Amino acid sequence: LIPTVIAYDIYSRLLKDRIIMLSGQVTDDLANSIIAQLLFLDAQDSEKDIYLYINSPGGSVTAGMAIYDTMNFVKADVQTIVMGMAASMGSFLLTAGTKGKRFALPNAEIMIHQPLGGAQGQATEIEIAARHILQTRERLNKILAERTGQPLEVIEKDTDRDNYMTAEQAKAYGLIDEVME
Amino acid sequence: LIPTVIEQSSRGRAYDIYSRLLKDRIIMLSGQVTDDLANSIIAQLLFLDAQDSEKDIYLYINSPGGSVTAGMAIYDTMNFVKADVQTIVMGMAASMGSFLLTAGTKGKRFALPNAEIMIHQPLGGAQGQATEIEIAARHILQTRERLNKILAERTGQPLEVIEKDTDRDNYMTAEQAKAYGLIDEVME
Amino acid sequence: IPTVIERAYDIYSRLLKDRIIMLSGQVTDDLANSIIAQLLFLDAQDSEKDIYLYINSPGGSVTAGMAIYDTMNFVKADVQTIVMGMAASMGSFLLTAGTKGKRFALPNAEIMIHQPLGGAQGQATEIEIAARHILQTRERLNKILAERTGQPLEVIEKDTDRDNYMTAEQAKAYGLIDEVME
Amino acid sequence: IPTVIRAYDIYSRLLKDRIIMLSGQVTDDLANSIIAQLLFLDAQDSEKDIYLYINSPGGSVTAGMAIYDTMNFVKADVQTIVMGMAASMGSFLLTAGTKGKRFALPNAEIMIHQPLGGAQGQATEIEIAARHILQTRERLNKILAERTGQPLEVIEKDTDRDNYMTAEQAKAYGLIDEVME
Amino acid sequence: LIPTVIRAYDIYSRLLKDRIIMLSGQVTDDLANSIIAQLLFLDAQDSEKDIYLYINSPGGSVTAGMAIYDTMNFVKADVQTIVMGMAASMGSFLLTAGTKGKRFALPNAEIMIHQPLGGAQGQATEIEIAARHILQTRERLNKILAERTGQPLEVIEKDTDRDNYMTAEQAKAYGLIDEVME
Amino acid sequence: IPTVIEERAYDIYSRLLKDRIIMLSGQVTDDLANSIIAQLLFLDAQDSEKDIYLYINSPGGSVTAGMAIYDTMNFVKADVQTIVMGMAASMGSFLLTAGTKGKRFALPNAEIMIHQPLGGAQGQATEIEIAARHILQTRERLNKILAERTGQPLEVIEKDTDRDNYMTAEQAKAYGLIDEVME
Amino acid sequence: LIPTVIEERAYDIYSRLLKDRIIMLSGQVTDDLANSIIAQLLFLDAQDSEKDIYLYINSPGGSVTAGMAIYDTMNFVKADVQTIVMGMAASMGSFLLTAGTKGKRFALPNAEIMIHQPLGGAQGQATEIEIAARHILQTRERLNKILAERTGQPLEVIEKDTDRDNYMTAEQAKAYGLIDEVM
Amino acid sequence: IPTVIAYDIYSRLLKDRIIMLSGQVTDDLANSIIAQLLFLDAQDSEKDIYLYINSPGGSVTAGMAIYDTMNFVKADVQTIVMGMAASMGSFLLTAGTKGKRFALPNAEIMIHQPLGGAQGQATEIEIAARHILQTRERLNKILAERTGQPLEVIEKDTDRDNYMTAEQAKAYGLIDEVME
Amino acid sequence: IPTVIRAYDIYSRLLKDRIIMLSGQVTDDLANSIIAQLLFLDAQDSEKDIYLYINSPGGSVTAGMAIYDTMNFVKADVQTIVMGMAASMGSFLLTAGTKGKRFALPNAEIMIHQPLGGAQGQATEIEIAARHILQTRERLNKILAERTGQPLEVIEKDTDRDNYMTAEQAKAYGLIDEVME
């Protein structure tokens, strides 16, 4: 499945030029790999930018926040380019790229919505899970407000249901800085 | 299952066959278009344009289609790189496969003589509350409209013709696809 | 299912002799057919005496419900509705369709209103057709609710956007029912 | 299924008054019951009407055509009332009621579309199946044209995809004669 | 599911009092047993009055069908056959087995004729036995079709090679039935 | 299952049993065997001078259930006529040919099949040897009975039951399984 | 499962055969297999278009479009492609066998060759089924024309002969025109 | 799979012209065996090839592919059964070069008729029946040649599963020697 | 599976010192590996012994016989040590080691019993399969008789049901020569 060039596998070759591929569902396993790569790249050289290409429908909130926190932590600027899709945690990591350096390819789809979950058990247990997810929504929304410049109450209205945006629409909304042609 | 080839070289080389073809700027797009496939193709397109933007890239396609967004990722990458991207369909290019075929640089889109090409409308699914279904319907109709506009540009056909011709599964011969504008030449 | 006694009825049939219909569980085509048959039979037998429709239902098929709704309005007899336990979705719709002044809830009944649920699969065109259909279904039901409750249509839309659980007292205040019976 | 006092089950009591219930999916089993009932009622008295109440999403084309052919066979007029839903073969049977005696309750849903099927195997086998279903579409559409007064080419455009109609829309179109309030 | 009519008969039993037999759905051993019992009972009761066999069937077991076929020919009474909806495979075979001059189709009936279907697994010898058996079955059924229709045997072989759908009128023309009844 | 009126109301099979007809249809199981046996016994008690009619449409089934029916047919004082309609295979054909001689019939298009017993064994070598001895004894017993019922010599019955052997009604009359084909 | 051979260089056995211009087409024809065969065909022609390519076939068939991709590639490359069937070449396997350069299509003496019509399925609305039927009939017609050209048989003979599964001996296939010699 | 000093053990045996045929005969196994036979003949047609067989059989056509390849190569192909050679396994055993077909003393050899299945219309079943009968006839003729037995004996003896001892198989003509 | 330093995997290192590990179920695949190893080691040097460590619950009769026949074929003496368990074909291969050189670790379990099998179908087919498995039992029992010095009829009585032995019991019986402490 994965070609080699002269000897690196193609993804490792891209990493030599400070490119990280974030593809598919955001899981603990993917997060661990992205994080290792971000750390390695910042140790090697904190003056040169990192490029994070994103094509993801989302996934684990916590796995995403681990990547998010690691992006903010490294000294180097992290540029983000969405290609294809950035939905849910994918769009959250897109908008976390260093401001001025968050891009979408012209036909990318960006989607924002509320966190999804489940709770089962006694009334008390369901209340604890409800509190937890609502706190998670509130924390992510505050971050979105800061990343976009939109006020908090606008982010709440706009994430109530699945909200699909064009690359241009996302630029207008504040999620990205430029559409690259 | 995947054979390897050796190169008698003065610096000291064993490639798997697909990697040997990539040395000569050929990319194989085979099977269903998924996020994993898209990622590989995109990496390969980027790597080849970095290495040399003056020399063409050759994208061989045999695919029944797949993810619209994965496809659009590849489409946008083809247009991004400085190098011309030639496209050859062998066997089948259906749905997103045919869309990528016709996205090759104009004048350099080919079909092997017995290739099947098919175009249709996007497929999807939605479940839930009326409002959730309305959102999904809007989204897929916007996706149809965007892909149709690009097809109009890529083929020269007017938009309203593209709409009538993608309403149902539309199979074409390599010759029919040349006539229609999807490709430039049938190669013997 | 117990029997009572010289004629011998099953208990539900004995209640039907006194003009009581039990609507229990999911609203399906089979249940609708039975309810409708019972409504018709009771009206033929005597249109001057009221019919009592007891409801404990989480909902079900919109069209099966509408069949029952239309039948309730068709028969000359007044149809009183009492909710016991639950009336959700098409259940609450049928509750509020009872003759005005004769729609009741037992004190600890749960009433719920929301939007129709569905699914669509296939080509963009097919999805559009299904979307139009379910939105038209939402609109037609919401207009009927507006009439039944006295609430304006736009209030009904905001209030059915998500699952909206109500107390018997809250439902009386909202106009779904007329009285809470102790 | 409740009983009423001779002691009848409720559906059998309605049959004494010449009402037949067609509910749920049109299968061979359902068709056989409806057909038996239709035949019985016509034998018993051909001067008095039969009332066919329909709530059905459709089903077998051939099982439907068995009912259709029987409705036309019996001397007695067959009135049809849709309550809830008449889709596909359900709507076809609705419109087959005697003209002037086809009704809908006010909130009935009526749907018309083209026949559905499948075929598997050799090219020859697929061709035979394709010819068969196309001939079935053509026959049904001709009958619909007659039943509605619409011209054949209108019926073809209008059954191309799922076509949902209001009771009022169906009266306008010719499927039914009256909406009963 | 099955209504009753007033002595109190279930609807199928009431039709049997007037010498009508309903053959509906798949032809199985169970169905064959019922049809056969009914045919025998009716002939014992009165051999001078006709029997009416309504058919709506996609076919089924060859041997179950042959049991019904042999019984139809055995009884002294004429057996009229009417197809309504579908008579495919063994269904169409039993349709055409009705007494000549009294085999009917309703106008929109579908009739289908084809070859027998089967399977065999095992040693070469076992597969040869099974092949010989189903070919002999085909040949015996085709001979009887030839006789019932007036078509020569080699025409019946060409025409049953693949699924062959016929209109009521086409089936009249071919000899399978005598009249289309309006 | 339809019902018929005489005012007495029988289910159709029970009406046939009033006239001494027993239906053996489908697979021969312990449950079916129990019903057939009860009916045979009842009919003989009621009157041993009048014949019993056993209609058979069966692909076979349990050897021991079949043998229960066979033994009961021979036990009862009344003659048991057998008519095959459709199919009589394996134990079905064995019961067909067990009818009283001179009164075994086939409808003209009936299929009759004879073969060897089928079985299975799993476990230790000793356990499989036990099972093999048992099924071979079963084959030998049934073949002896078939030889007597048909008039064929044992060695012919062995060659002819080695594999599935389908017969026409006429072929089964020629072979000795039945007495007449009834038109 | 797959042994290796030494020459200071170590090849897996299939790769060693590819060094001598032999391609193995084994098992079902899928998009994955087609992609591998095609890569190999192109690589070998680039490396030297004057020396022949040897395509060994043991396949029951598979995807029509995957097969056509291999077919079109065989015709594209400058080098002659010899084809040898060993064991089986059925459906798309026999199509590829007969696509080898004329004069250089072989069968091992006990090879089985089978030709038939394309297989498929269609589900949905009448319109959708008509589209699918048209497509598969066009596919049959295209393949049959090619077979006519490759064998010398007239088109109407190819249509009668592919109506049902048609198994041929190596000698029968030589007689029919699908191959040139039995080796 | 252990290594020796660096070959994997099967590859080390192939350096000495030994091919292992183990387990079910499938298209994948046949492909590997065939590649190995071809490679060994190209490398040297004067030195023998040794095919060790432990197999319950499998695909008739896969087997015939191997059979035809054994006869094609110029080198003599010796066959040794160890454990089992049933159905196509026994057919390949007896295809080794005459005088060089062996069994280890406790080997089981079994011959029978081909197995198959058909489903569908009477015509389709007839086609399948003709095909499997032709396959039986072809394999039986080859067995007759390979063993020296007359065709009619091969037909009676393959009617049902027929298990043979290494000594019984030598007496019958399937192999030449039992090796101790 | 660890490696040790040339760099061998641990099993390959043991094979350099003429040790073969027979572990788990005896299958065609396992047999093929063992056989290849036995052959390789005899070609390399027929004067030095081979050591076959056994921990196996048994498996395929024919696979086991393949290993048995190979052990007898090779010029080199094959020592056998059971560790843990040698049941069914495992114990058969244990006792096939060169006499005087068959060992058990003190707490090894040895088990002998009869062959297991199955047959389905016609009486004739079952008789064939019964004859075959009885001939297999007789052939194995004869070899056990020779290997242990017990008479055949004792072997038959003693393999009739599962027969578990201690290392000491197995020495007494003749299956092995020594218990090694």
Ligand SMILES: CCCC/C=C/C(=O)N[C@@H](Cc1cc(F)cc(F)c1)C(=O)N[C@H]1COC(=O)[C@@H]2C[C@@H](C)CN2C(=O)C(C)NC(=O)[C@@H]2CCCCN2C(=O)[C@@H]2CCCN2C1=O
């Ligand atoms: C226990 C035995 C009687 C069971 C009751 C059936 C009944 O009331 N059907 C409703 C129609 C209906 C069906 C449905 F499924 C749901 C629904 F909401 C309404 C009905 O028509 N009631 C009539 C009396 O019945 C009839 O006239 C007849 C005879 C009866 C055996 C069944 N007719 C009907 O189905 C039809 C077709 N009704 C009519 O023809 C008349 C004429 C104009 C159309 C409507 N009709 C009426 O409304 C009559 C006139 C006076 C009031 N008026 C009923 O109550």
Ligand SMILES: CCCC/C=C/C(=O)N[C@@H](Cc1cc(F)cc(F)c1)C(=O)N[C@H]1COC(=O)[C@@H]2C[C@@H](C)CN2C(=O)C(C)NC(=O)[C@@H]2CCCCN2C(=O)[C@@H]2CCCN2C1=O
């Ligand atoms: C509604 C009434 C129907 C009940 C009839 C049952 C019946 O006919 N049983 C068979 C035995 C039998 C059972 C079976 F499961 C299978 C089978 F092939 C045969 C029977 O024995 N019939 C006798 C007359 O009936 C009896 O003597 C009684 C009384 C009855 C209530 C049931 N006896 C029996 O079960 C037994 C054990 N029969 C006997 O004990 C007598 C005495 C000597 C031993 C056997 N018997 C007979 O054979 C009698 C004398 C000669 C003929 N002879 C019957 O027909």
Ligand SMILES: CCCC/C=C/C(=O)N[C@@H](Cc1cc(F)cc(F)c1)C(=O)N[C@H]1COC(=O)[C@@H]2C[C@@H](C)CN2C(=O)C(C)NC(=O)[C@@H]2CCCCN2C(=O)[C@@H]2CCCN2C1=O
């Ligand atoms: C291990 C490395 C070898 C890779 C081999 C690639 C190759 O041979 N492609 C085929 C086209 C093809 C693709 C496919 F997917 C299936 C198939 F059957 C055929 C090809 O066109 N070969 C050319 C010569 O090679 C090329 O010109 C190049 C350069 C190379 C890096 C890959 N070019 C191509 O892919 C294409 C598209 N070929 C061309 O662009 C030329 C120019 C005009 C359009 C078509 N071309 C040809 O037909 C050339 C000219 C004469 C014949 N003519 C080849 O044989």
Ligand SMILES: CCCC/C=C/C(=O)N[C@@H](Cc1cc(F)cc(F)c1)C(=O)N[C@H]1COC(=O)[C@@H]2C[C@@H](C)CN2C(=O)[C@@H](C)NC(=O)[C@@H]2CCCCN2C(=O)[C@@H]2CCCN2C1=O
């Ligand atoms: C062996 C190494 C192979 C790596 C090649 C990567 C490459 O070409 N990325 C595309 C961006 C892209 C990403 C993607 F995921 C999909 C896609 F279609 C396109 C790219 O930007 N190419 C640049 C040249 O490279 C860059 O400037 C860098 C450095 C490189 C290690 C990766 N940069 C980027 O990812 C970004 C963000 N590009 C830029 O920073 C510049 C500055 C302004 C924004 C966009 N840029 C360009 O377009 C540059 C300027 C001129 C054209 N222009 C490229 O071709």
Ligand SMILES: CCCC/C=C/C(=O)N[C@@H](Cc1cc(F)cc(F)c1)C(=O)N[C@H]1COC(=O)[C@@H]2C[C@@H](C)CN2C(=O)[C@@H](C)NC(=O)[C@@H]2CCCCN2C(=O)[C@@H]2CCCN2C1=O
């Ligand atoms: C409501 C009660 C129904 C009772 C009738 C059943 C019946 O009609 N059986 C068919 C035979 C038959 C069985 C079957 F499973 C399928 C089938 F197509 C046909 C029958 O034989 N009818 C006879 C009259 O009935 C009988 O003679 C008797 C007595 C009765 C209790 C049942 N007999 C039979 O089963 C048999 C074996 N028939 C005969 O014994 C006579 C004598 C020679 C053989 C054939 N027989 C006749 O054909 C008789 C003589 C005159 C015409 N002739 C019937 O109609």
Ligand SMILES: CCCC/C=C/C(=O)N[C@@H](Cc1cc(F)cc(F)c1)C(=O)N[C@H]1COC(=O)[C@@H]2C[C@@H](C)CN2C(=O)[C@@H](C)NC(=O)[C@@H]2CCCCN2C(=O)[C@@H]2CCCN2C1=O
């Ligand atoms: C790592 C490389 C070493 C590979 C070793 C293989 C080996 O030892 N095979 C056994 C045969 C055998 C196969 C099997 F699958 C199971 C089994 F128990 C035994 C073998 O034959 N050993 C011979 C020496 O080897 C050979 O002569 C050759 C050449 C070698 C590459 C493989 N020959 C064989 O397979 C055959 C067929 N053996 C012979 O031809 C000779 C001639 C008469 C028949 C048996 N032969 C021998 O026994 C030779 C003669 C002296 C003793 N004598 C071995 O030890």
Ligand SMILES: CCCC/C=C/C(=O)N[C@@H](Cc1cc(F)cc(F)c1)C(=O)N[C@H]1COC(=O)[C@H]2C[C@@H](C)CN2C(=O)[C@@H](C)NC(=O)[C@@H]2CCCCN2C(=O)[C@@H]2CCCN2C1=O
């Ligand atoms: C080629 C090797 C690549 C390894 C890259 C490691 C790295 O970048 N660690 C992050 C911490 C971190 C961990 C994590 F799991 C996620 C995440 F987002 C961030 C880091 O803090 N780097 C330091 C550099 O100095 C270190 O101590 C590094 C060296 C490395 C071998 C491991 N240290 C650490 O684990 C941590 C935890 N660093 C510290 O604890 C220091 C001491 C006080 C607390 C915070 N620290 C720093 O902030 C140091 C000093 C100033 C900035 N400051 C780094 O960048």
